[PDB]
Design a protein around this nucleic acid. Structure first.
Lengths: 74, 240, 129, 135, 88, 70
RNA sequence: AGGAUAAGUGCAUUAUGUUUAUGUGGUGAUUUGCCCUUCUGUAGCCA
RNA sequence: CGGCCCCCUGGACGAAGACUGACGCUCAGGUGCGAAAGCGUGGGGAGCAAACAGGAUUAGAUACCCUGGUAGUCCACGCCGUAAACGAUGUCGACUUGGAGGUUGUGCCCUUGAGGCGUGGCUUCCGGAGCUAACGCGUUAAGUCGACCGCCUGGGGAGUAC
């Protein structure tokens, strides 16, 4: 049936998690290792818009201490 | 008749795929993709296959020899069934590069075969060391598999039968320089260009390629059955 | 920007025949049409129509022999800033007169055979190959 | 006007300073015809790595619109604020003022996982629970 | 890009009385307000070279459309240059 | 250099394969060589070049069969 | 108060190869091919 | 041109309502403006380094290779804008089968591959016509042409001299 618009598993095989928002910690940790750093966008099969915009939103999130900045912080 | 068009669709609803690449020069017979799978335009292909089958009927009386080329592992058995008799030659264990241009050399290697088999079955080269007999037994086997269904062919064939162009493009090139009328079934990455009748098709789905082959053989061969009786009666007026 | 629009006309015909296209359509002019009229009657194009009330537009069909091209190129000689003029006595010979020169004379646009038969001179527009 | 999504955190012991400061900053936004489009208090949270020392800070997402002129004076005042440890404000382009990615996690904080203590009473006095001095 | 409130003032005073933004007189006036704001910036920021590219566009078109306007009605020109108080 | 990604059940040997995904790369990988400002865009960003190898490796299995080399 | 949890495919000294001084010049396998190859070889050639 | 953010501001991409109507192309002269270091003074110096010392190397070692280590690198204004100033295309413009990627306005999808279709987008791979000596280009040309400017006429010596 028409207009269902983003039920599940639909638009993309890997879901876009955020766009440019960074205030929830859990959407951000969707692509952040236990070492405390981003997985490459070729590996994740993420959509480019959300990733390009994440490069600003993660630097932001590290700077507001929602995330570890650095390997030393375990 | 409208039956030829009904065959084309029964076979064609695999639509091929070959991912989203395709080849721009086939585009008029190509519908736009359904989520990163190529999908063909089938309505513009059904006239084609019927026009080619009406032309096949007419060459039955002009020809002595068909060569079935564009064979591959899944479709070879289907080519065996399409020749039916020795007015139809076929290659089903791969074509080899220069088989028409250098037919000359194949016909010398055919002369080696019918000899070396009648020597084998006689028992004739198996003496001395095992090496001298075996290097001949093994080669006799490579030749026998390659040539068995084209072995009697006395000269360059009267038409050319393509079911797939993907590795056998060269057989089509050489045939056109020898001035032979070409009957093609071309896949989605092949071009429709440069041959005398084409059916636009696709190379995938073993159920489609089987139906294309069953259809070609009937139009040429029962036109041919009628021709042979006619020819005796045509020849006899001269001797009278 | 559009500094010669007859160079674009000829370039539209040239890519027409080379890419084996059946028709080529474009914006129209009194000059484009007047060249096309000599080309129609000498069979250097096949036929054309003119349609567009708002702005005029020309659609034409290409030079053949059997159904694909037998003419290689059509090029302009008189052009912007390098206008070339020939006298009545000096009207050109293009592929020993198998080809045309389209020549705009004081009395309008015609082929080198009608300019010669007239005893007029003028501007030598474009030659066939 | 253009939209600037500010989020900030405040040093625990110094949190009693912000409840006075917030009511001038909001008057400088609505006095210029801007709006405060949510004002969400997050409660006390644990820093991952310290910022100006101490492992704790108290979280506010204000969610502003204001003209470009006014926010420039107001941000330079917040950054040289001793109470604020850090703030980040995100770009105008394609920016949301509704439908919070953290909407459930904000409610959870407030309901069940907060401090329930006097320095985070102050944080809510600068939060949605605004208590403010008369002007 | 211009403030809303200037763009309507410019529309009331300049072009035709249809209150358009496309005619030569009001486009000259729309470039001028963007030039005028920028020469105020260009008292400093003397290494700001990618934006200067723009300055030179807005000046070059202003020269051209005033040249056009003298190629057209001499009334429209003589009014425009005096109603928009241009150059020194 | 035990690699920060934590091992399932703690032990004296770090399980150095099962941890790495994106570590060293670009930050500590060009170690003891001279550091540039904008070079990384053309020195290091070789993702396009590497996708064509991922496509050729997955294509050939099927084609080796289809040519009849297998 | 972690809304960050051994995961996100998590894979290859994490490509980048990691020590060792120099040494002159030229040299080989056959036409005179004749400047020429064809309007009865043929529906003469040709548009 | 690469941390992230605000102020000032350019340039590009989409879409409706709507407007002026060749106001166009190219450009001798021209003013304006730097990858990098060079460069005048102020501010700044953590690290690395030309030089400089010494080791190591060895047909001998200024190159090779290492350690110490300064100006330099960093910011602000200012001075001639230098080179490898590029798709190993002068500029822009008009025309030429397309498909798909990278990735983006936006209508629609089971909103079922960084996905599809509808209709625009740059940017790019692939290959058909044409073009090249060859690589290569291919609808953003190095095709089909169009205008105008810059500039070449064997090497060395000299990109200097004048």
């Amino acid at each position: 049936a028409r207009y269902f618009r983003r039920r599940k598993f639909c638009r993309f095989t890997a879901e876009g998690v955020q766009e440019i928002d960074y205030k929830d910690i859990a959407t951000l940790k969707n692509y952040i290792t236990e070492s405390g750093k981003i997985v490459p966008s070729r590996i994740t099969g993420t959509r480019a818009k959300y990733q390009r915009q994440l490069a600003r939103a993660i630097k932001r999130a590290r700077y507001l201490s929602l995330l570890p900045y650095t390997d030393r912080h375990q | 008749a409208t039956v030829s068009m009904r065959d084309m669709l029964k076979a064609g609803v695999h639509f091929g795929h070959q991912t989203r690449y395709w080849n721009p020069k086939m585009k008029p017979f190509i519908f736009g993709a359904r989520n990163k799978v190529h999908i063909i335009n089938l309505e513009k292909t059904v006239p084609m296959f019927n026009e080619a089958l009406a032309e096949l009927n007419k060459i039955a009386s002009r020809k002595g020899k068909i060569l079935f080329v564009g064979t591959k592992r899944a479709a070879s058995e289907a080519v065996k069934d399409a020749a039916l008799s020795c007015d139809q030659f076929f290659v089903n264990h791969r074509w080899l590069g220069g088989m028409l241009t250098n037919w000359k050399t194949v016909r010398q290697s055919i002369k080696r075969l019918k000899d070396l088999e009648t020597q084998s079955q006689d028992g004739t080269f198996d003496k001395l060391t095992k090496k001298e007999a075996l290097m001949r037994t093994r080669e006799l086997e490579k030749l026998e598999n390659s040539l068995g269904g084209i072995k009697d062919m006395g000269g360059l064939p009267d038409a050319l039968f393509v079911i797939d162009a993907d590795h056998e493009h060269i057989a089509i090139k050489e045939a056109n320089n020898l001035g032979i009328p070409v009957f093609a079934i071309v896949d989605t990455n092949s071009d429709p260009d440069g041959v005398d009748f084409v059916i636009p098709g696709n190379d995938d789905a073993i159920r489609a390629v089987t139906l294309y082959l069953g259809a070609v053989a009937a139009t040429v061969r029962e036109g041919r059955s009628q021709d042979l009786a006619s020819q005796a009666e045509e020849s006899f007026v001269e001797a009278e | 920007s559009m500094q010669d629009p007859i160079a674009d006309m000829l370039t539209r015909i040239r890519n027409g025949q080379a890419a084996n296209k059946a028709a080529v359509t474009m914006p129209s002019s009194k000059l484009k049409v007047a060249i096309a009229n000599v080309l129609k009657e000498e069979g250097f194009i096949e036929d054309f129509k003119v349609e567009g009330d708002t702005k005029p537009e020309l659609e034409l069909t290409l030079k053949y022999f059997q159904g694909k091209a037998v003419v290689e190129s059509i090029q302009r000689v008189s052009r912007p800033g390098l206008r070339i003029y020939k006298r009545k006595d000096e009207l050109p010979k293009v592929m020993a007169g198998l080809g045309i020169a389209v020549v705009s004379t004081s009395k309008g646009v015609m082929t080198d055979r009608a300019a010669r038969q007239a005893g007029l001179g003028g501007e030598i527009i474009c030659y066939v190959a | 006007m253009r939209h600037y999504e500010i989020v900030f955190m405040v040093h625990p012991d110094q949190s009693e300073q912000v409840p006075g400061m917030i009511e001038r900053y909001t008057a400088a936004i609505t006095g210029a015809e801007g709006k405060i489009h949510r004002l969400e208090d997050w409660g006390r949270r644990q820093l991952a790595y310290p910022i100006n020392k101490l492992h704790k800070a108290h979280y506010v997402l204000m969610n502003v619109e204001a003209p470009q002129e006014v926010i420039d004076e107001l941000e330079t005042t917040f950054r040289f604020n001793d109470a604020v440890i850090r703030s980040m404000v995100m770009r105008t382009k394609h920016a949301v003022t509704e439908a919070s990615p953290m909407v459930k996690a904000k409610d959870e904080r407030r309901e069940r996982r907060d401090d329930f203590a006097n320095e985070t009473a102050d944080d809510a006095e600068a939060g949605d629970s605004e208590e403010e001095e008369e002007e | 890009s211009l403030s809303t409130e200037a763009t309507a003032k410019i529309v009331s005073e300049f072009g035709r009385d249809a209150n358009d933004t496309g005619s030569t007189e009001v486009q000259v006036a729309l470039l001028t307000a963007q030039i005028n704001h920028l020469q105020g910036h260009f008292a400093e920021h003397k290494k700001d070279h990618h934006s200067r590219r723009g300055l030179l566009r807005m000046v070059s078109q202003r020269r051209k459309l005033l040249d056009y306007l003298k190629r057209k009605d001499v009334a429209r020109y003589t009014r425009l240059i005096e109603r928009l108080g241009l150059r020194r | 250099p035990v690699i920060k990604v934590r091992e399932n059940e703690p032990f004296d040997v770090a399980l150095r394969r099962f941890k790495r995904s994106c570590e060293k790369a670009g930050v500590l990988a060009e170690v003891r060589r001279r550091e540039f400002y904008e070079k990384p865009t053309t020195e290091r960003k070789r993702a396009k070049a590497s996708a064509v190898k991922r496509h050729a490796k997955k294509l050939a299995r099927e084609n080796a069969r289809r040519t009849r080399l297998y």
